[PDB]
Design a protein around this ligand. Sequence first.
Ligand SMILES: [Cl-]
Ligand SMILES: [Cl-]
Lengths: 108, 108
Amino acid sequence: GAVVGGLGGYMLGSAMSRPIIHFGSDYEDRYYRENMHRYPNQVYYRPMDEYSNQNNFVHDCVNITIKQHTVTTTTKGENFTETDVKMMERVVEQMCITQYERESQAYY
Amino acid sequence: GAVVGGLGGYMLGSAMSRPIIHFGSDYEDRYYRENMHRYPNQVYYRPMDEYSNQNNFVHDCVNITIKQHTVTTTTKGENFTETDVKMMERVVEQMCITQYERESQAYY
Ligand SMILES: [Cl-]
Ligand SMILES: [Cl-]
């Protein structure tokens, strides 16, 4: 809900399909596939009349877009994927078991 | 900052070291390693005197602990890891490039 500093003068583009990007490592390749929805699908940018080259336009766009995405608030639930749910059920169960042993030890 | 329903009567345990869990698949194995800090390191539980077996204690603990973790609010930045940063720089740059082409096309 907050806004990163110095965002005045930037405009928000219309959504686009998140690019399908492939990676060498199978890890990164699968990771992106399962997590891309967690990244933006639109970017912030300044008026064309302010630039003389693509590079500077892109520089500004990438940096402020990532910063704004980063400060954007959200619950951990929407940030978690199927994989995370699976991971948590496993770790929380082991920890819930550790808590049981703690309670039993110092019982009463 | 919010609280999941029916949390009254549950107590929050003290933190513990998140368990190191290994997986068959190298993907899940590496994934957990890089993302475990995103999961809880403490669990909610009810008084020992309310249970007759470990299973039910653990059942309650796991389910409400995950639900409470899930509703917990946070910015996307703290949920992102080194890998995510890398992913975003790549996807946002391509999209920032698409926005440049859109602006150039309908220029002025
Ligand atoms: Cl647009
Ligand atoms: Cl404790």
